[PDB]
Amino acid sequence: NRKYPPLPVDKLEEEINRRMADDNKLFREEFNALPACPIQATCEAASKEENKEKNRYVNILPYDHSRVHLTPVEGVPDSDYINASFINGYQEKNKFIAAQGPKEETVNDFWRMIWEQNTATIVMVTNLKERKECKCAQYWPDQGCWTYGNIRVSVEDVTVLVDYTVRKFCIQQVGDMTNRKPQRLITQFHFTSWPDFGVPFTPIGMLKFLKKVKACNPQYAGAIVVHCSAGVGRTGTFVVIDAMLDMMHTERKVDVYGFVSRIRAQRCQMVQTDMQYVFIYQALLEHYLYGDTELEVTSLETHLQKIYNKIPGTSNNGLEEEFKKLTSIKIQNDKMRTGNLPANMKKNRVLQIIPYEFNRVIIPVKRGEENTDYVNASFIDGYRQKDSYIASQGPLLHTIEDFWRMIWEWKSCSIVMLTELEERGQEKCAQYWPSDGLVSYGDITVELKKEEECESYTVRDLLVTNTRENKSRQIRQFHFHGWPEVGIPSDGKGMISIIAAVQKQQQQSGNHPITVHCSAGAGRTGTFCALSTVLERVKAEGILDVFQTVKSLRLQRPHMVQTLEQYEFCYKVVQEYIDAFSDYANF
């Protein structure tokens, strides 16, 4: 096709911008211009009456020339069929299997394919359910061992992170004492962060996911099995990103149109929607613009020398270079509608800092009052859990009741306050806790039980009672006093201590969303969220990605880490934490 030729990388950003314009106008044309199939193909086996219960959809059928054949089972007619196809990589034939997520009745067939194909790696790009609709049968055990036909599957390990879960299994074909085959270590990469509507708010999760898959797949293994529900949409997105990253590295070009066309010779509808197609381009651009910003702790000193000094041939340091990339990202004005409604405008401290719709913190509608579901607060992904933080403005006098309804609704047991009530003679936050005894805000009563005074913060033990529900909760407020009226704290000691105190409270109260606020709920709030995530990850892995941590916050709530000095403070605290606990093994 001469209308969608390969794109050199230096025109990738410009072309994405043009193709994204007028509501993805030229991207939709491009996607709609994909061939259904560039070759003459048949689906005789897939269409056989005897195989009908083995397919999720009558119109998603593997082609005869590219289908994955199961070995015939003696006495079982039609036992050679599974809904799965071989798929080429950039330069490698049949690198992948694109498979349907098994149905209950094809779980055994799915495992037999994995065994027969010598597969080491399974890539799952669907949740089991979307809105109580089953997308995929759970084909793995949660603990111990289960036998699926003649394939014994034993749980080895499970690692849960915010964007994906990695599960290790020991598998073995059993049932023949005269032919005991050796066990195989299988790794399942489960992408859990694709939302039910739209695409991930950032492509970095998908790029990190792909990196781990590639690093883990061993020599001698057969095709990597990639599946979603139908095995064409998100499955196609994964395979095409992998191939196009290779093309970018080898040719300094991408050809998404050409590559998607090519793999459609092997399986119908690979990349099933315009939004999946656009997300491929977004992931390639993410890689091209930012590359790998993860640092092993032993690389941090070298990185900080770069960050804090002038970039040669420029008038900026590395900190300014990184910060300019963060501020160059677009605030999505069409996603900030609810906070901008006339009835909600007075509930916001700062017009430009209001939630995006996709992660806005929704509260119960009070009685029969419209626009009463709104608070200026956003759910933020952490290191291990989705919605780890509520990034909230500090309440106004007239939003304290809404603030408490939010805390109660979302089960927060940790409140982090990163402002004084007044700074530089300006009101920054309304007092929402009692200085002594009891205070009431609608259905929520708040009693002060204990105070402790730490070096940089006060801890207030609050007994919080919903008087409608007749239920009480112990909620701890961490009131940070270490933030100066101008600039940033002189050191990270206070920030490190308050993050540790919150982590302690979370561990013993059930790891509910942490309510984090300053005044407008972006600058200091963003710094606390960024550092809670970075310190948890550095402790777990000895890796830090300050740049992508802050970038993801900017994509979840406007101005998270609002200023250059706040961004500087993120690096200063991480450096101090590592230097303080330098003998910690993972570093």
Provide the CATH number for the domain around residue 414: 3.90.190.10
One domain, residues 192 and 299: no
**Radius of gyration of the CA atoms of the chain, in A:** 27
The answer to whether 145 is a known catalytic residue is: no
- Point out the domain boundary residue: 292, 311, 342: 292
DSSP 8-class letter at 268: T
One domain, residues 415 and 345: yes
One domain, residues 197 and 230: yes
List of residues 6+ apart from 483 with CB closer than 8 A: 418, 419, 489, 518, 524
Catalytic residue among 136, 228, 268, 529: 228
What is the separation of C-alpha 275 from the centre of its chain, rounded to a whole number of angstroms?
A: 17
One domain, residues 69 and 210: yes
CA distance 84 to 116: 13
| Nearest C-alpha neighbor of 376 from the set 340, 413, 334, 409 | 340
CA distance 256 to 268: 16
One domain, residues 269 and 383: no
Catalytic residue among 268, 429, 518, 529: 518
CA distance 282 to 235: 16
Q: Under DSSP, is residue 145 helix (H, G, I), strand (E, B) or coil?
A: strand
What are 8's strand-pairing partners? Answer: 253
List of residues 6+ apart from 438 with CB closer than 8 A: 445, 446, 447
Note the residue count of the chain.
587
One domain, residues 333 and 396: yes
One domain, residues 172 and 314: no
Q: Which H or E element spans position 152?
A: strand 151-160
One domain, residues 200 and 301: no
Q: Exposed, middle or buried, 263 (CB in 10 Å: 0-12/13-18/19+)?
A: buried
- 16 contacts 281 by C-beta, under 8 angstroms: yes
List of residues 6+ apart from 152 with CB closer than 8 A: 145, 146, 171, 172, 173, 174
- Point out the domain boundary residue: 253, 276, 292: 292
One domain, residues 210 and 94: yes
List of residues 6+ apart from 166 with CB closer than 8 A: 157, 158, 159, 187, 188, 189, 190, 212, 216
What are 402's strand-pairing partners? Answer: none
Residues comprising the binding site for substrate? Answer: 196, 228-234, 272
- Point out the domain boundary residue: 270, 292, 314: 292
Q: Which H or E element spans position 555?
A: helix 546-556
| Nearest C-alpha neighbor of 455 from the set 500, 502, 497, 501 | 497
CA distance 214 to 222: 13
Domain that includes residue 182, residue range: 1-292
Q: To which residue do tokens 């394919």 refer?
A: 113
The answer to whether 518 is a known catalytic residue is: yes
Residues comprising the binding site? Answer: 196, 228-234, 272
Q: Which two tokens stand for residue 302?
A: 């070298």
DSSP-derived pairing of the beta strands 253-254 and 133-134: unpaired
One domain, residues 265 and 308: no
One domain, residues 321 and 253: no
Q: What is the number of domains present in the chain?
A: 2
| PDB experimental method | X-ray
What are 67's strand-pairing partners? Answer: 85
First to last CA, the chain: 51
One domain, residues 45 and 94: yes
